[PDB]
Scaffold this active site. Structure first.
Site, short mmCIF file in Angstrom:
data_model
loop_
_atom_site.label_atom_id
_atom_site.label_comp_id
_atom_site.label_asym_id
_atom_site.label_seq_id
_atom_site.Cartn_x
_atom_site.Cartn_y
_atom_site.Cartn_z
N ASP A 33 7.87 -41.00 45.83
CA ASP A 33 8.73 -41.29 44.68
C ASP A 33 10.17 -40.86 44.95
OD1 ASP A 33 6.97 -42.55 42.80
OD2 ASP A 33 5.96 -40.64 42.55
N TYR A 65 3.47 -44.27 36.15
CA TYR A 65 3.49 -42.83 35.97
C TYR A 65 4.81 -42.35 35.43
CZ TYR A 65 -0.96 -41.42 37.95
OH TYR A 65 -2.30 -41.27 38.22
CU LIG Z 1 -2.79 -38.99 38.84
#
Ligand SMILES: [Cu+2]
Ligand SMILES: [Cu+2]
Ligand code: NA
Ligand code: NA
Ligand code: NA
Ligand code: NA
Lengths: 620, 620
Positions: A290, A374
Site C-alpha cells: 500500500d 480496505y
Molecule cells: Cu484483513
C-alpha cells in the site's frame, strides 16, 4: 521558518513551474511522486534549502525520470533517466485505475468470459491490482496491472459481495494492451447483497445509545506553531506529511527540566504489505504494497468532526501534488487531540495515611486512508509518562472470492457461496533513533531462568541478559515471546544519575511475521517482513525497507542490500526497523463490513529519566 | 428476587446470629472468610436457598472450622473441623498484621539488631508477609507470618524508601512467639526520601493541563435493576462481589434478535501470585497470593468521582463481613460507566459512492485494591461488537531492598543504595464457559506454514489447524506466539447459518509464565502459573486454581489435582483457566511511585453471529 514545515501550495506551484520551464513536464508527463526532502545531517548552519524529490512518468513509453528540485534557488539539481527493468517501475497512478476496466470492456476474450456467466459488462467492476513479478517474461520492463472482477447490481451496490471467481486479466497500461485473459472455470457469483446501510439487512437501528459528550471548555493543552510544531505536556515534535508514507513525526523530544532531550529523529510507517495466502492462480500473485506501490498518503480521507474524530479537535490540511503538478489540499486530513487515559498512578498507604491518585492522558495524531476495499487508520500516541505508541486500525470490506463446494484450506466462508482468502497485513516502522543525541546502540534483552542449586537454594531466582548488537550483519533479530524478549535503544555516552546509560525499551506484540515460503517472490520483495527487527547505520538514501521503486521490482531491494555493508552500529547514528502485523483468517463477523482490529508497538523509557517524570502532574 | 443478587447487610447479620446461636462464634472466634455460594447446576426449579460459606478461625489455638449456613432456612448446614497441617491454614486476618510489629518491638533479638543499626524501634515499620512453606519443620500446622522492616522518619514519610536489609523475623501469631530472628549483616539504610507529594521532590506542579469534560447529558445507556443486574447494548449480566475474588461476573449473555444467548456463566480472577526472584535469604521465601492468602476484595478502595472514575459513573457499594460477623459496606467500591472507544467500522467506497463511519464504545466495570505497597485495578470491558476483555492495572510503590555495592543480577537500582528485587505479577482467570449453553469444547488453533511445490507453486499459501482437547490430561497448554496460537471455545451442537459450530476465540498476550525452578516450593504451590491454559470439567467444589486453603499449604492443591481425574471435556460443561502476567524488572521511572502498567486477555466472537452484530448501530 522551520525547515520541517509542511509543503505549501506555493512550493508545489513553484516546483511545477521549475519542471515545466526545464522542459521536464510536457503533455505526456505525469508526476507519480512528489515530496520534500528532509534536511541533511548537520544542518546547524541555517543553510536553508527546500528541496523536492519528483518521480516523472511518461505515458508515451519514454523512460521515466527521477528529479530533485530546489524551490529555494529555483533550479533543477539533478535529473536521472530510469531503466525500470533494472531498478523497478514507478508507483501506480490514480488515473491508471480506470484504464483497466475500460480496456477489458472492449477485449473479446473478456467479453466472452462475461457472456458465459450471463453478466452485463456495464455492471462488472474491475479491481486494478499491482502485478508483482512472477513467471511472465513479457512483463519485464512494462507497466502491468492485473484485474479481478466484481458485479455491481445497481449504482449503490457493494460489488465486493459479488466476486467473479475463476477469471483474471493482465493489462499493459502504457501500450493499452490486454496481455492475458485467464479463465479457469465458471463459479456461481454469490447472490446475497452486502449493503450495510440497507434497512432490510441492518434491521431497525438501535435507539438505546445515549450521547457521550467530550469537550474542553478552556481549549486543548497543546499548542500548534509554525503550521505543524506541537508542544504538549513536555513533548515537542513536528508533524510532517508525505504522499508515500503519510504522517511522519520529526524531532520527537521531551523537556526534562531545562534540557530539551531528543528521543526520535524521524518516525514513520515506511512500508506496508498485504500478502494473500490463497494458492488459486486467480489470486496467488496478489500482494499489495500500500505504501510503496500505491502511496497511502494520497488516498487520505477528510476526517469528519464528531464521527471520525471526537472531542476538541485540531486539524491539519496537508497539501500534495496531483499528477500534473497542481497543488491539492487534503482538507481535515490529520486529526490531533488529547484524550483522558484513565489512572496514571495511585497509592493508598497505610503507614503514612496518604491517599494519592493521578490521571493519565495521551496526545493523539491520526489519519485514515482508503485503498480499494480496505480502510486503515494510523494512530500515534504520546503519553504523560514518556511512552510513545503506534497503533494501526484495520477496517473496511474484506477481499472476497467464491467459496468452493467441498471447502478450502486457505479461504473462509462468510455467506452462502462467498469466501474470503486468508492474508496478512504487515507494517514496517522506521525509527531514526536519537536517544539523548545521535550516539546510540541496540541491546537485545532476554529473561534468564536459573537452576535451583548453590546460590539459589530455594529455586526462586531469575535474571535477564542484554546482548549488544555491534554490526549490521548481526542486527537482524526475531521475537521470542516465551523469553520476554525486548530491545533497548540506549546512549552509551549519556548517563542517568545512577551512572547507567539512558535508554528506551521497544515492546513488540510478537505477532507472526511473513508466512510465505522463503523461496517465494513475495518473500524476496518483502524480505523486511520475514524478521521482527533490523538495525542499520543511518544513510541519507536508505529510506524504505523495500527500496525506492517497489512496483514490479524483482526482489532483494532495501534492507537485505543495506545490511550487506556490515557497518558499525555500536554507539552510532542508527535506524531501527520494526516489522509487525496482523494475520487475518476472516470470520463471519467481519462481513459485510469489518469491525476494527488493531496491532502496533510501543516504546517506554528505561532509565532515561532520573525518577518518575510525572511527579509534577496535579490532582483533580 | 434474583439468586445472583449481592449479599445484603441483613443476610450477613442473619449469618452472624445463626452462627452465634449455634455456639460457633464465641469471643475466641474470628471470621476469616464469608461469602455467598452460587446456585448449584440446574436451579431451574426456583428452589431459592441463599447459602453462605464461612471459615472460622480460633485465636486460642483450637481447630478452625468450615461452616455452611442457609439464611433462607436459618440453619447450619454443615460444620467441619479443619486439620491445617493437612489441608492448609486459613487466610490471613487483618488484625494479625499489627501483631507482628508489636511482638517484635519487645523481642530482645529484634531490638539488638535495630540497636546495631542505630534505629529507633518506634520508627521501624514491619511489613507482615505470608510465610509459604520451606525448610522449617516447626512451622507445620502453625500460623506464621514473616516480617521485613522499613524506617519511617516521621508519620507522613514513605517507609518504602528506607528498607532495613539483612534482617527478617518469623512470628507465630497465635501463640504470640517470635520463632526466629535472622540477621545476615548490616546494610546502610537508604537515606533519600520517596515522598511523592513533597514539593521539594515534585517541583512546581504543572499549570499546562486544561480540563477534559466527559458528560452524558441524557444519562448512561445501561440500566441497573435488582441491585446488580446490568443491561447494556444487547449485553446482559450480573455483577457479583466476593471478599476473596473481588468483582465476579455472572450470566454474561448477548441479545441476538429475539434470543438471549449465553456466553460465560461465571468469570473471575480466581488467584493472583507475586513471586520474588531475589535469592537473598532475607527475601527468597517471598511470594504473595493476594487473592488466596489475603483476600483482595476486603481491601477494595472507595473510588472517588472525578479522580478514580471519570464521567457519568454508577456505583455499587458491596457489603462484606468483618472478623466478628458485622456487616461492613465498601462505599463506592465498584465503578460502572460507558466509554467512547474510537472508530468501530469505517469504509469509503469508490464504486458505490457511500461513505460510512460508526463509533465504538465499551462498558467498564472496575474496582481497585490495596495490599501493602501495591495497588491493583481490575477492569472488565464489554464492547459493542461482542468482545469481552479483562485488564489488570498495576501501580503503587515497588517493594524495595538495599542495593549491594558491586551490583546484583536479581535487583534493580532505583536510587543511591536503594534496590528493587525482580518479581512477577501473575493472574489466573477462571472462565466457566457457556457458549450458547453448556455443551462446549476447546480447540487449539495454530497457523500452518506450507512449502512451495505442487498445489502451491508460487509458495504463497498458508493455513491453520485446529486440535480438539478431549480429556483433561491433554488440556494443559502452552502459548506459542510464533505460530499465532489461540484457543477457540465452541458449542458443537449450536451452529451458525453456515452450519459451523458457534465459538469465541481467546487471544492471550503471550507473556512469560512462572520463571521459578520447577522444583521450587512456589512452583508446587502455584502450579497453575507454569502453563498458559488449563481446561477442566465443571465441578461445584473446584473453585480456585490453588485450592481452598492457600496459606502455608505444602503444594499440589488445585489444578494439578483436579486434572488427574482425566475427565471428558469434549462437548461438556467446562471451565477454562487462563494464566497471564507481568514480569517486572523495575526501572528508575517506577520510583518513587510507579506509573500504571497493564496486562490482560480478550475473547472475540468466532462465527458466533451470522454476520457483523453491529450493523444496527446508528450514525453520529
Ligand atoms: Cu484483513
Ligand atoms: Cu511489580
Ligand atoms: Na531487476
Ligand atoms: Na539515528
Ligand atoms: Na500438607
Ligand atoms: Na461451563
Amino acid at each position: 521558518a522551520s525547515p520541517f514545515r509542511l509543503a505549501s501550495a506555493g512550493e508545489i506551484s513553484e516546483v511545477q513551474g521549475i519542471l515545466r520551464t526545464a522542459g521536464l513536464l510536457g503533455p505526456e508527463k505525469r508526476i507519480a511522486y512528489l515530496g520534500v526532502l528532509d534536511p541533511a545531517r548537520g544542518a546547524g548552519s541555517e543553510a536553508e534549502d527546500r528541496r523536492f524529490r519528483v518521480f516523472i512518468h511518461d505515458v508515451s513509453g519514454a523512460r521515466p525520470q527521477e528529479v530533485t528540485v530546489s524551490v529555494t534557488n529555483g533550479t533543477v539539481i539533478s535529473a536521472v533517466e530510469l531503466d525500470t527493468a533494472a531498478t523497478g517501475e514507478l508507483p501506480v497512478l490514480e488515473e491508471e485505475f480506470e484504464v483497466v476496466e475500460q480496456l477489458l470492456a472492449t477485449d473479446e476474450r473478456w467479453l466472452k468470459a462475461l457472456a458465459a456467466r450471463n453478466l452485463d459488462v456495464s455492471k462488472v467492476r474491475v479491481a486494478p491490482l499491482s502485478a508483482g513479478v512472477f513467471e511472465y517474461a513479457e512483463e519485464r520492463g512494462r507497466r502491468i496491472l492485473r484485474g479481478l472482477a466484481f458485479v455491481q447490481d445497481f449504482p449503490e451496490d457493494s460489488a465486493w459481495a459479488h466476486p467473479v471467481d475463476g477469471l483474471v486479466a493482465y493489462v499493459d497500461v502504457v501500450s493499452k494492451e490486454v496481455t492475458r485473459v485467464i479463465d479457469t472455470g465458471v463459479f456461481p457469483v454469490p447472490a446475497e447483497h452486502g449493503n450495510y446501510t440497507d434497512p432490510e439487512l441492518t434491521g431497525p437501528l438501535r435507539t438505546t445509545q445515549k450521547p457521550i459528550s467530550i469537550t474542553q471548555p478552556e481549549g486543548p493543552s497543546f499548542t500548534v506553531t509554525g503550521g505543524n510544531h506541537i508542544e504538549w505536556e513536555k513533548w515537542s515534535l513536528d508533524v510532517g506529511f508525505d504522499v508515500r508514507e503519510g504522517v511522519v513525526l520529526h524531532n520527537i523530544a521531551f523537556r526534562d527540566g531545562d534540557r530539551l532531550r531528543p528521543i526520535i529523529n524521524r518516525a514513520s510507517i515506511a512500508e506496508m504489505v498485504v500478502p494473500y495466502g490463497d494458492p488459486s492462480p486467480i489470486r496467488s500473485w496478489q500482494n499489495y504494497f500500500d505504501t510503496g506501490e500505491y502511496l497511502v498518503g494520497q488516498y487520505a480521507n477528510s476526517l469528519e468532526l464528531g464521527c471520525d474524530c471526537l472531542g476538541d479537535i485540531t486539524y491539519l490540511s496537508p497539501v500534495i501534488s496531483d499528477a500534473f503538478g497542481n497543488p491539492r489540499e487534503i482538507r481535515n486530513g490529520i486529526c490531533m487531540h488529547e484524550e483522558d487515559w484513565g489512572i496514571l498512578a495511585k497509592h493508598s498507604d497505610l503507614w503514612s495515611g496518604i491517599n494519592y491518585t493521578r490521571r493519565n492522558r495521551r496526545m493523539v495524531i491520526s489519519f485514515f486512508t482508503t485503498i480499494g476495499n480496505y480502510d486503515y487508520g494510523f494512530y500515534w500516541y504520546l503519553y504523560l509518562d514518556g511512552t510513545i505508541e503506534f497503533e494501526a486500525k484495520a477496517t473496511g470490506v474484506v477481499f472476497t472470492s467464491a467459496f468452493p463446494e467441498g471447502g478450502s484450506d486457505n479461504i473462509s466462508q462468510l455467506a452462502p457461496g462467498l469466501g474470503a482468502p486468508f492474508h496478512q497485513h504487515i507494517f514496517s516502522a522506521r525509527l531514526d533513533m536519537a536517544i539523548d543525541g545521535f550516539t546510540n546502540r541496540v541491546e537485545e534483552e532476554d529473561v534468564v531462568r536459573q537452576t535451583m542449586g548453590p546460590g539459589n537454594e530455594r529455586g526462586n531466582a531469575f535474571s535477564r541478559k542484554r546482548t549488544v548488537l555491534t554490526r549490521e550483519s548481526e542486527a537482524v533479530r526475531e521475537a521470542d515471546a516465551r523469553t520476554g524478549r525486548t530491545w533497548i535503544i540506549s546512549n552509551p555516552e549519556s548517563k542517568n544519575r545512577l551512572n547507567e546509560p539512558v535508554g528506551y525499551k521497544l515492546h513488540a506484540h510478537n505477532q507472526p511475521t511473513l508466512l510465505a515460503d522463503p523461496g517465494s517472490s513475495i518473500a524476496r520483495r518483502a524480505a523486511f517482513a520475514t524478521k521482527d527487527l533490523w538495525v542499520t547505520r543511518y544513510a541519507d538514501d536508505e529510506r524504505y525497507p523495500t527500496g525506492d521503486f517497489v512496483n514490479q521490482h524483482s526482489g532483494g531491494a532495501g534492507l537485505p542490500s543495506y545490511i550487506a555493508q556490515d557497518r558499525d552500529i555500536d554507539g552510532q547514528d542508527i535506524v531501527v526497523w520494526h516489522t509487525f502485523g496482523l494475520t487475518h483468517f476472516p470470520r463471519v463477523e467481519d462481513w459485510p463490513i469489518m469491525p476494527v482490529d488493531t496491532v502496533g508497538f510501543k516504546l517506554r523509557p528505561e532509565g532515561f529519566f532520573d525518577r518518575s517524570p510525572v511527579l509534577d502532574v496535579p490532582a483533580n
